[PDB]
Amino acid sequence: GTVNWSVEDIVKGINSNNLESQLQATQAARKLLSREKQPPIDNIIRAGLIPKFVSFLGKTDCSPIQFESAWALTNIASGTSEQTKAVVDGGAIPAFISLLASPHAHISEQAVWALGNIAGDGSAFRDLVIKHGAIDPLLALLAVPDLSTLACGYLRNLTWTLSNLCRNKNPAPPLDAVEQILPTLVRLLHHNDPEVLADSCWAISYLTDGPNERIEMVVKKGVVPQLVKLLGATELPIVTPALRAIGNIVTGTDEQTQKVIDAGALAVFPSLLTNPKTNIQKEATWTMSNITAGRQDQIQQVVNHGLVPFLVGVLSKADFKTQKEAAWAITNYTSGGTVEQIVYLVHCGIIEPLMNLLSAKDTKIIQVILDAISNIFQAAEKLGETEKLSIMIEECGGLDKIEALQRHENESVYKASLNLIEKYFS
Amino acid sequence: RKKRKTEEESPLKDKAKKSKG
Numbered sequence: 482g483t484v485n486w487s488v489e490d491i492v493k494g495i496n497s498n499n500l501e502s503q504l505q506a507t508q509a510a511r512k513l514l515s516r517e518k519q520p521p522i523d524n525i526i527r528a529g530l531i532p533k534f535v536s537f538l539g540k541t542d543c544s545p546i547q548f549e550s551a552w553a554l555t556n557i558a559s560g561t562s563e564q565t566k567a568v569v570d571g572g573a574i575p576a577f578i579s580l581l582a583s584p585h586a587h588i589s590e591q592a593v594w595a596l597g598n599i600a601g602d603g604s605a606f607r608d609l610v611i612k613h614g615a616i617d618p619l620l621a622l623l624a625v626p627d628l629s630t631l632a633c634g635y636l637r638n639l640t641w642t643l644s645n646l647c648r649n650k651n652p653a654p655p656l657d658a659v660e661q662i663l664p665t666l667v668r669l670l671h672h673n674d675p676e677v678l679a680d681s682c683w684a685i686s687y688l689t690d691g692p693n694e695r696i697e698m699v700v701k702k703g704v705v706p707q708l709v710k711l712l713g714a715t716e717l718p719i720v721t722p723a724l725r726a727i728g729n730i731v732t733g734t735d736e737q738t739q740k741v742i743d744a745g746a747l748a749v750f751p752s753l754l755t756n757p758k759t760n761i762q763k764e765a766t767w768t769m770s771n772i773t774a775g776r777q778d779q780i781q782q783v784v785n786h787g788l789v790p791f792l793v794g795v796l797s798k799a800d801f802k803t804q805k806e807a808a809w810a811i812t813n814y815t816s817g818g819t820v821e822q823i824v825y826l827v828h829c830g831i832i833e834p835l836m837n838l839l840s841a842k843d844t845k846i847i848q849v850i851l852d853a854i855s856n857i858f859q860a861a862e863k864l865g866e867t868e869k870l871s872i873m874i875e876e877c878g879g880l881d882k883i884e885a886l887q888r889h890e891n892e893s894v895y896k897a898s899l900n901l902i903e904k905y906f907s
Numbered sequence: 908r909k910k911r912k913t914e915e916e917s918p919l920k921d922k923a924k925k926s927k928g
Binding site for chain 1: 909910911912913916917918920921923924925926927928
């Protein structure tokens with residue numbers, strides 16, 4: 482008698498002066514909003530049920546209706562921004578924060594879930610949730626000696642919701658809120674459950690996405706080693722976010738980058754640069770491009786770990802977007818590397834795969850490659866080996882493309898082309 | 908400016924919201 486009710490029947494019951502009738506009707510509403518597909522979220526909102534639901538949240542005397550309305554509001558909140566807005570507009574945020582203290586673990590978990598959807602909408606609601614004081618109660622829910630004593634699903638929801646409070650960049654979460662949350666985050670990152678680890682990595686992933694001061698407060702917490710370890714996980718849902726975090730960290734100062742190198746992250750790249758999941762391969766190559774954009778001694782670490790042949794590998798064959806990140810990694814390498822290091826790169830066979838990419842329909846990758854060729858010749862010019870390099874580029878159809886790009890349209894291109902042709906060739 | 912920050916952020920991003928089935 483609470484299965485597949487019509488919205489009007491639900492309205493009929495919730496409007497009666499009978500708490501039990503309202504309870505059945507609320508549960509019926511929750512079931513519509515929980516059905517496999519096409520939950521009537523808009524119809525429920527129009528019927529003006531949100532205010533009734535929000536008010537039921539504050540009924541301590543009847544915990545069951547607190548749960549049902551919490552679940553209904555959770556699913557409405559999981560919709561579009563307009564739908565989530567409807568829930569917030571009803572005054573659900575503070576009502577939910579009060580439920581976090583509930584003696585019924587399943588009710589506060591529902592509250593944790595709803596707050597998760599509200600904060601997940603974006604910067605504005607995220608910061609509004611924080612202003613209503615949700616962080617302390619949430620963290621208090623985790624203030625226990627051993628995370629393993631908490632129910633599996635309850636922990637997964639808390640972590641996920643915390644990762645949403647760390648999410649979004651315009652603007653980034655409040656600095657003081659991040660500091661509050663981090664210590665707990667550092668602890669969840671050492672929990673054995675793969676979902677908890679994934680969402681913890683995602684959170685760190687969001688916090689490291691921004692200015693170097695942001696990256697600093699995370700690195701300062703000493704998590705780089707743990708992130709490197711998770712980088713070698715067998716579960717793709719863990720490797721993906723962990724790699725994104727490590728990648729973000731190396732977009733910062735050289736010293737922040739040295740932290741990932743010291744933690745031994747380079748030893749996992751032979752695998753990542755040939756990973757089956759194209760995305761993991763794209764992210765990894767992009768990460769490499771930022772490391773080769775560092776100090777000569779860091780470029781040298783890339784060399785010692787034998788990662789150059791892997792870059793040659795990616796540049797030679799891979800998804801186009803991955804190849805583009807490879808180009809960058811090369812142009813950066815050649816731009817800050819020593820003469821001896823640029824020579825090594827050539828000995829690894831970079832010239833041919835680099836020349837072949839010039840046939841690509843993408844003015845950006847072409848400027849990047851033409852650029853690298855320049856840097857390479859510049860190094861050869863320092864050894865009187867320019868001719869020898871000309872041959873190689875001439876031997877593998879290289880010149881037959883620079884001369885081509887010489888008739889290109891983009892000013893930056895034909896110029897760079899025209900130059901290389903006269904300064905080292907014809 | 909050697910370092911290149913994030914683009915489209917495409918490990919995509921975990922679903923921002925979850926419906927309780």
